[PDB]
Amino acid sequence: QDPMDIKINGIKKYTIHVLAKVSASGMEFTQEKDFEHQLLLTDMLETVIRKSVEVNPVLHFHLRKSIIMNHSYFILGLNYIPPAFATKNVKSIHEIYQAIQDVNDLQLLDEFEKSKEKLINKIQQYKHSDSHSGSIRLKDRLFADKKYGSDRLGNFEKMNKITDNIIYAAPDMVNKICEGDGLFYHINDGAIHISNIKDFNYYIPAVINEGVEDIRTDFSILTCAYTFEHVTDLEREILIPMFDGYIGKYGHSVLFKTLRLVDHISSHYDQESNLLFITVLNQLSTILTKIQHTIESIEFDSVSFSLSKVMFENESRFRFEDINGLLSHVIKQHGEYKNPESFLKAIQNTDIADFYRLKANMRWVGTSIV
């Protein structure tokens, strides 16, 4: 029996129910030495298990080794038709475990090459993203560890050299998925249930190389990185994302208005690394000083702040519309932020004084130009 039944009421009523298990791999994902091995086996397992579990009433089966604030987690998910609306009842969590342990080793070998090529292509396409590559190269040098940037989806050389003898590590992975302690999430009847109170202690890498310049020579873009000190949960989850939309997203952003004087602008806050990036496509030399001076002399006002609160609430509401965005939110958020209503209320209760605390804790750390 579960130790608790944390029932969060007032949830949007979905056409399906969801049963998810989140198993903690406490060590930071860079400390895991078999990271590329664990990724490959997990996708192999997911593919084989999916063929056996994704039958009526199960509509979608999910099994991934995901990173949540620089910590590995096994996340098993089951989307299914509710029993009152299904011609067949759903298997229990025990029967799902039994299906995972009944996976045949030849079935895994049949998926080895396809899963390996799938993950290899994800590593390449994620590294081969120019606007993000500037953010990738910055995170590599800012943290002095390629696992936060290039090797975030796995190192290519390590992943490309995996042979099919990885099959012998499948029992270790099956054990970790089935027997490792974790939290159970259950979405049904306009409510989400959590099996226990537990907040995943976040980990944010510290910047080792401060003031990075990526002088890169290539023939036919810029990217600047900023961080924040003394980051609270309110800032990382609400205030800083609002600030990112304020300066480079919400319509007449501060950067679009600033750079239109010169006359293709993007910005994004990376919660995993606590880094706010700014990417803009000779003329880039004047834009560099123009962007720096704009962030240094950034100002706010309560009228436009109230609009950023409304916009960010609606963006959060749109994520809650998706049953997976709702589930991911309830998994990741701490304490009362798990409740979407509390999270939305926390957005509504922010004030402009919070932005001036954030501005005082903001600083530049890196720039990448190609």
């Binding site: 056409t15 399906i16 009526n56 509509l59 609306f85 299904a86 409304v310 519309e321 979407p340």
Partner: protein, 347 residues
């Protein structure tokens, strides 16, 4: 069980006349946002000069005010796009703002005056778009020459003929409040022109194959089934034949789009359908199960529900009638359309 689920979806689904337009309503309890969509019957095919897309740009303007700016200040993002036969105006917002946002939107859509400076400014904007799927986009945008042959009199006449309540479908998905004329008095802002007749002008390197054998809903089922069957056979045989779909709300028939270069390989696959006797029956059974599974999954996303309302006219039809049409597709229907496709490919 399965019957009660279809009944569950149908009791939340309704469609009624409001003023001189129609509102399709799908209520969702405790949804976080409400999707409102205003769909006007005019697209790239209704007039082949890019006029519909031009009007879409003009419709954002009324008395020097831009409705995207008005919505943005109200915390709502108004998105508009022109397809082959319709122009859509879609936005998300909390339910308390739906009535006022919708009435403000229809205020702009049923405005029929555009000064010369607004027309010429939007022409320059659209020419930059033309100079900046590909054939479908450039057909909707038109050319810089085609839109340059239309002036204020044409655009205002087209607005009065096509931007009317009678030529408008409204879809409101999520929430629980009903849409009525008292809150949207713009739903009677009519002109002297009724609903225009469904004139299409489908205008050389592709062929259009009709799928027409049964009711309106049945044609969508068969068209998706045959297109999915051909793609599956083209994978095992490692062909390279793209099969596009022309499925429009105003078209009783559905159509397959295939490159004229790929006609021979597609014709071979169509004839390959009737080879394995059990292939058609089992693929129909798989499709019926997959269609129901996708509908259950998709009926959580507001935009996906909207796509069911535009493709299958959900609202006019119930979900029971949708699944009834799906369950009525047999291998004899496939073989019948297979024959008419072969006859079309022969000549």
């Amino acid at each position: 069980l399965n019957k009660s689920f279809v009944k569950k979806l149908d009791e939340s689904l309704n469609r009624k006349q409001v003023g001189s337009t129609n509102v399709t309503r799908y209520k969702i309890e405790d949804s976080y946002l409400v999707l409102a969509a205003v769909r006007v019957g005019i697209g790239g095919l209704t007039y082949h000069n890019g006029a519909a897309h031009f009007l879409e740009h003009l419709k954002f303007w009324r008395y020097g005010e831009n409705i995207y700016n008005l919505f943005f200040q109200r915390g709502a993002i108004l998105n508009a796009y022109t397809t082959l036969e319709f122009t859509d105006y879609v936005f998300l917002s909390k339910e308390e703002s739906i009535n006022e946002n919708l009435n403000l939107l229809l205020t702009f859509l049923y405005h029929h005056q555009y000064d010369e400076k607004t027309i010429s400014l939007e022409r320059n904007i659209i020419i930059n778009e033309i100079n900046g799927i590909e054939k479908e986009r450039h057909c909707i945008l038109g050319s810089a020459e085609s839109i340059s042959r239309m002036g204020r009199k044409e655009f205002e006449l087209i607005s009065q003929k096509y931007y009317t309540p009678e030529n408008t479908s409204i879809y409101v998905i999520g929430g629980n409040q009903d849409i009525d004329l008292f809150h949207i008095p713009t739903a009677v802002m009519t002109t002297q022109y009724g609903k225009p007749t469904h004139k299409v002008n489908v205008n050389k390197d592709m062929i259009l194959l009709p799928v027409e054998h049964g009711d309106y809903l049945k044609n969508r089922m068969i068209c998706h089934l045959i297109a999915d069957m051909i793609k599956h056979l083209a994978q095992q045989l490692e062909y390279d034949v793209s099969v596009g779909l022309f499925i429009s709300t105003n078209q009783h028939s559905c159509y397959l789009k295939v490159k004229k270069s790929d006609q021979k390989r597609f014709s071979s696959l169509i004839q390959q359908l009737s080879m394995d006797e059990h292939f058609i029956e089992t693929y129909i059974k798989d499709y019926q199960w997959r269609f129901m599974n996708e509908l259950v999954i998709n009926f959580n996303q507001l935009h996906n529900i909207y796509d069911y309302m535009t493709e299958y006219r959900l609202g006019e039809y119930t979900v029971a009638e949708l699944f009834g049409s799906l369950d009525s597709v047999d291998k004899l229907d496939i073989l019948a359309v297979r024959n008419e496709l072969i006859n079309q490919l022969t000549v």
